[PDB]
Amino acid sequence: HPETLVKVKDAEDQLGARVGYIELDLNSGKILESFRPEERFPMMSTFKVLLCGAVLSRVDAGQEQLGRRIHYSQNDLVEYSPVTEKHLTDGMTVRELCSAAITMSDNTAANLLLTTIGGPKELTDFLRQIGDKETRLDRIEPDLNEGKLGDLRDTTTPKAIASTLRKLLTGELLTLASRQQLIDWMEADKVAGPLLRSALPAGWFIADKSGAGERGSRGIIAALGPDGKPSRIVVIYTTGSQATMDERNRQIAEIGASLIKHW
Numbered sequence: 001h002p003e004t005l006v007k008v009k010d011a012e013d014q015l016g017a018r019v020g021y022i023e024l025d026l027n028s029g030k031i032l033e034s035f036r037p038e039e040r041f042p043m044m045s046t047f048k049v050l051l052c053g054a055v056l057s058r059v060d061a062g063q064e065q066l067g068r069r070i071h072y073s074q075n076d077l078v079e080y081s082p083v084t085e086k087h088l089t090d091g092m093t094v095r096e097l098c099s100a101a102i103t104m105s106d107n108t109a110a111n112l113l114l115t116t117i118g119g120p121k122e123l124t125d126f127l128r129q130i131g132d133k134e135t136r137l138d139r140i141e142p143d144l145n146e147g148k149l150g151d152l153r154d155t156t157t158p159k160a161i162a163s164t165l166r167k168l169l170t171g172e173l174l175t176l177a178s179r180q181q182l183i184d185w186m187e188a189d190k191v192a193g194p195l196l197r198s199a200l201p202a203g204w205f206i207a208d209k210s211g212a213g214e215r216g217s218r219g220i221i222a223a224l225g226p227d228g229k230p231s232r233i234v235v236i237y238t239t240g241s242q243a244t245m246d247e248r249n250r251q252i253a254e255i256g257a258s259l260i261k262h263w
């Protein structure tokens with residue numbers, strides 16, 4: 001809607017950075033609104049949904065078990081690992097790692113899951129196989145968050161990842177059980193959801209994953225809608241801003257508020 005576009009523009013002005021935006025009809029994939037949809041942005045932790053999609057595809061294929069226990073060490077622990085730092089001695093199952101990666105954005109959990117699939121290149125190969133020609137993962141956490149100027153590593157486009165999310169959450173790419181488990185991880189309550197959840201009316205559905213990185217990188221992917229059911233996918237990314245984190249968050253949140261207001 002034009003009111004959302006204007007909020008996107010305001011965010012670019014206030015933040016001193018580009019903002020990419022797309023909104024798809026969930027059922028049809030029709031593009032309802034877009035701004036810089038084919039430009040590249042760091043995915044940051046939004047990739048963790050794609051990662052868990054790849055893990056679930058392996059589960060469906062009999063190549064992984066959700067119950068398999070993953071044992072790791074102190075030196076595997078990286079920054080922002082609130083769940084995995086509590087399981088050095090006992091390990092975590094694949095299921096537990098996906099829950100942590102998505103609901104808690106746990107960085108080490110994502111690295112361990114990357115190991116289970118064979119790494120960034122294997123995630124990228126899965127994405128190419130499902131028809132995403134743009135998204136690429138090159139590095140693990142935390143380096144994938146760097147957001148360096150003119151660096152194509154660890155990027156997507158709003159249009160690419162929106163389509164990929166739709167493929168994961170709808171249709172038959174994943175079995176019903178895996179699709180529902182991915183959904184459920186994304187729906188689960190989170191500690192703080194400034195970008196879309198904080199202002200979202202009660203009773204609306206949202207399955208989301210946010211991301212934050214260096215050099216102003218911030219964004220979110222989500223399926224959401226009224227009456228308990230998702231009906232749209234939205235993707236919002238920005239990178240380059242040196243405004244405060246609070247200002248970045250507020251500008252993105254205002255885009256979301258407008259999408260909801262003018263739904």
Ligand SMILES: [Cl-]
Nearest residue numbers: 034035036037
């Ligand atoms: Cl545009």
Ligand SMILES: [Cl-]
Nearest residue numbers: 036037038039
């Ligand atoms: Cl574009």
Ligand SMILES: [Cl-]
Nearest residue numbers: 088089090091
């Ligand atoms: Cl134990």
Ligand SMILES: [Cl-]
Nearest residue numbers: 070115116117
């Ligand atoms: Cl493994």
Ligand SMILES: [Cl-]
Nearest residue numbers: 193194195210
């Ligand atoms: Cl959020």
Ligand SMILES: [Mg+2]
Nearest residue numbers: 187188189190
């Ligand atoms: Mg809830």
